[PDB]
Design goal:
Chain B: The chain crosses the membrane at residues 15-34, 49-69, 93-113, 126-146, 150-170, 225-245, 270-290, 322-342, 369-389, 395-415, 420-440, 461-481, 508-528, 540-560. Chain B: High-affinity urea-proton symporter involved in the active transport of urea across the plasma membrane into root cells. May play an important role in urea uptake by plant cells at low external urea concentrations. Chain B: This is Urea-proton symporter DUR3. The structure is cut from a larger assembly and holds 2 copies of chain A. The first copy, chain A, has 50 residues and is an all-alpha fold. Chain A is 78% helix and 0% strand. Chain A has helices at residues 3-10, 16-35, 37-47. The A-B interface holds A 15, 18-19, 22, 25-26, 29-30, 32-33, 36, 38-40, 42-43, 46-47 and B 582-583, 586-587, 589-590, 592-597, 599-601.
Amino acid sequence: SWDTIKSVCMGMFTNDRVMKKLDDLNHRLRALTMAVPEAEKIYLLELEKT
Amino acid sequence: VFTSFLVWLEKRYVKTGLIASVIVSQWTWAATILQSSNVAWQYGVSGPFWYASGATIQVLLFGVMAIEIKRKAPNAHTVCEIVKARWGTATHIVFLVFCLATNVVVTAMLLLGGSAVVNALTGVNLYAASFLIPLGVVVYTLAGGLKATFLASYVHSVIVHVALVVFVFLVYTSSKELGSPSVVYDRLKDMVAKSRSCTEPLSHHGQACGPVDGNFRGSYLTMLSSGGAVFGLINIVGNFGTVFVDNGYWVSAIAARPSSTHKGYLLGGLVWFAVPFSLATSLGLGALALDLPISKDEADRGLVPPATAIALMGKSGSLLLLTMLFMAVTSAGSSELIAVSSLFTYDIYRTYINPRATGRQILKISRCAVLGFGCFMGILAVVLNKAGVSLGWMYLAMGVLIGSAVIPIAFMLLWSKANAFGAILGATSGCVFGIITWLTTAKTQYGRVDLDSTGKNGPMLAGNLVAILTGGLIHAVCSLVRPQNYDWSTTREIKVVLREEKLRRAKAWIVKWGLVFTILIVVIWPVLSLPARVFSRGYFWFWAIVAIAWGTIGSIVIIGLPLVESWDTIKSVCMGMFTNDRVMKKLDDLNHRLRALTMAVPEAEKIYLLELEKT
């Protein structure tokens, strides 16, 4: 039983659980940005401005 | 596990400064730390110089060889593959047995050196330690990959150098016995006094006393010693064998890209000079000053550095020397286990047994040859150890056996008129002639053939010279009758299972600025110091200051330049551990993406404002 020990160790000294949950939000919001026609364009108009 | 942790850390958060640091690590083994002090204790000051000079002209020239590796037969794996592709099958076994013999001799030296030091330092049984040494160098070889690289080697060169500065700043500045270089000069002039009498029982036979035979006026401070110019002539011949036949250096010369790092070879060949020159002058001459009771047969086993270290700094110095030696021995034995494992897999499991191997079986066999050869060296190190064979006897003899096949490996990379079957009678006549001459010279002038008679500078030189010249002579004579006119095209066709301009420029640079330091260190330095017949009270100060400066400027460069060259990686790793910049950066992406969504929907943005003031 080494997968359980590895999961416990990675769940204490690191923050893989927090990082993994933000990726779900990013992936979900990518669909929303791609769905609305104008919004995506605005995104580009912001990305270069900064 | 330290290297594994470091590489995991580097992976989680994704020239001429660090390739110089791997040449330093890949050329330092146990004989550098142990045998260098032996000749210093035996011959005075012409020992650490002659030892570190003949062993430093090879690091330069091998760079030229590296060029040919990337210009005449690329994407190779070993050295026997090139001769297999060039001169057929009649030579692939004759130059495989020799490549195995060189590899076994080099590691047997490591076993004979590492066991003898740990024996008379902690009380561990000699025969038990002689077998358990090639087990920690096998765990390290397996756990951590098989083709270990930069990050590990850089650690080896820091521990070695951080202990070199201690053993000079102690013996020459900070100690309470020696203290200053002046005291060393005072002690070194008392041992050669003609009024000294040390017959029985005042001193035993074969020890440090009286006037040294061979030196000028019998002094420990001279460069006119005849017993140091014969050992220098031997060290040159015996190191052409462990650089051209080891096959552990072609592995490192294949994974090296000399197109943009030729300066690294020159840089690594100048900092290494301070490892056997700044340590054999402090721990080697520090034992001669203290009049420590060291027998001749005890220095031949490499036991002068531990004696000086213990007598100067007790337990702490003993532990530091043990740590340095055991960092030097494992990192050098791993390079031999890897060399012999790839010598058994890519040379004979695939040209004769299984010509259609895959990526799953190759790894399997190059995982058990490590364990098999590792457990065979542990056995061979017990048979030799119970024979009176010492580290100082194999070093002076390793050029006699393998030195024959040194010329017909350079002919295969730098001469088109090198024919076939010539190396058949050039690499076989050389070995037998050298051994025969060695034995008859050791027998004629002493009347007995034993380890005490075949370990002197008389027979060893007469064997090394003939072994390294007669093979080349026969090969050259045979070449002038049957030309080959090899186009160097077949060797370029091997399975892979403006560029020439850069290579030519790099070769021209490494020949010009490389040969300008060989002349200045091997021909200018001894000649310009010979007229000082006996070192004065001030010239020795210059000689000691040069040694101290060389061991601190280079030691600073080795530790610092890799850090400065690659600083963005260290900064990224540091910021990825103690801070949370990665988490904060990812929220900004979400905020920027959602700003577009809030700006797109007309009403929503307004509602946002109606909320912001309400709270």
